[PDB]
Amino acid sequence: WEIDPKDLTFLKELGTGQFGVVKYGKWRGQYDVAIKMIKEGSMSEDEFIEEAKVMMNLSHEKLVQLYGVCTKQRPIFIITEYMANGCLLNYLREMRHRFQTQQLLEMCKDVCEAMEYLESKQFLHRDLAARNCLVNDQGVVKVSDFGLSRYVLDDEYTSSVGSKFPVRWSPPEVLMYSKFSSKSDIWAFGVLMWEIYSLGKMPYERFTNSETAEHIAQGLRLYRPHLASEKVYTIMYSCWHEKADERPTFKILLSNILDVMDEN
Ligand SMILES: Cc1c(NC(=O)c2ccc(C(C)(C)C)cc2)cccc1-c1cc(Nc2ccc(C(=O)N3CCOCC3)cn2)c(=O)n(C)c1
């Protein structure tokens, strides 16, 4: 979907991300959207454009939809669904004292439903984390910016020893071999569950990235957050099997989460 930029009305600055400035606006004066203005040199643009239709056809209630692109111009735009409460990481930290544990589990279910859909399309997120989930005006969590890490032009992000690489969300086979798969998204989802139940703490805080890599390679795992029941912790821990083929699928994880909800 090539969106006509004449149909976009820019309204507010939303800050800066890995591709530069993002704005809040409207499409045809009615629909709320976010507009990424892709900073020159920040993205493998020809590669993204050549391959972008698959990402737009990803359609699920728990994904932040990629509505379309503007490519007849410089800089190019990526137009997405707008989420009024911003990223999950900040939402957890700002509302820390108000969450009931049932709401935390509901957040995990939201993300797991999105990831099961992506899994069913054999589409990898590659940077799943609370910072890359967003929250709408009714508290629904949705997964954002799935697949875009592949187009980043930034050595500090693409190198596993770079300061921006998502080391704390990465399984050993990503850290050692750059082997991304459905099972590396599974690992990251476990860390995301830990972020949710810790109410937005940094995983492996006070460890550097390389200390984190060193110690998870030797079997160090994140502790059980106080608000996670043992059943919940068993689910997130199952995502962190050293061997990728011993990790569940998102279909299994979703069944596990629903069973806890039913038992609750
Ligand atoms: C998403 C985003 C970015 N990252 C990126 O592009 C980006 C690019 C690439 C990657 C990888 C390739 C590395 C994976 C990751 C991220 C940067 C900047 C913006 C947004 C953003 C904010 C929204 N939404 C709101 C809404 C409200 C507020 C807010 O200020 N508050 C919330 C309520 O309480 C008061 C304060 C803030 N953001 C919203 O909907 N989308 C769709 C988007």
Curated annotation (Swiss-Prot):
Consequence when changing R126Q: In XLA; severe; prevents activation due to absence of contact between the catalytic loop and the regulatory phosphorylated residue
Phosphoserine: residues carrying this PTM: S210, S229
Tissues with expression: Predominantly expressed in B-lymphocytes.
Protein location: Cytoplasm; Cell membrane; Nucleus; Membrane raft
Result for mutant: E195G: In XLA; moderate; interferes with substrate binding
Amino-acid positions noted as binding clofedanol in the UniProt annotation, renumbered to this chain: T80, E81, Y82, M83, L148
Domain Protein kinase residues, every copy: 8-261
Phosphotyrosine, modified sites: Y157, Y223
Ranges annotated as spanning the membrane: none
Effect of D127N: In XLA; severe
Domain of life: Eukaryota
Locus of motif CAV1-binding: 187-194
Residue ranges that the Swiss-Prot or TrEMBL entry lists as coiled coil: none
Subunit and interaction comment: Part of a complex composed of EEIG1, TNFRSF11A/RANK, PLCG2, GAB2, TEC and BTK; complex formation increases in the presence of TNFSF11/RANKL. Binds GTF2I through the PH domain. Interacts with SH3BP5 via the SH3 domain. Interacts with IBTK via its PH domain. Interacts with ARID3A, CAV1, FASLG, PIN1, TLR8 and TLR9. Interacts with MPL/TPOR.
Assigned protein family: Belongs to the protein kinase superfamily. Tyr protein kinase family. TEC subfamily.
Function of the protein: Non-receptor tyrosine kinase indispensable for B lymphocyte development, differentiation and signaling. Binding of antigen to the B-cell antigen receptor (BCR) triggers signaling that ultimately leads to B-cell activation. After BCR engagement and activation at the plasma membrane, phosphorylates PLCG2 at several sites, igniting the downstream signaling pathway through calcium mobilization, followed by activation of the protein kinase C (PKC) family members. PLCG2 phosphorylation is performed in close cooperation with the adapter protein B-cell linker protein BLNK.
Domains: entry comment: The PH domain mediates the binding to inositol polyphosphate and phosphoinositides, leading to its targeting to the plasma membrane. It is extended in the BTK kinase family by a region designated the TH (Tec homology) domain, which consists of about 80 residues preceding the SH3 domain.
Stated name of the protein: Tyrosine-protein kinase BTK
Species name: Homo sapiens
Source species taxonomy: Eukaryota, Metazoa, Chordata, Craniata, Vertebrata
Gene from which the chain derives: BTK
Residues of the full protein shown: 395 to 657 of 659
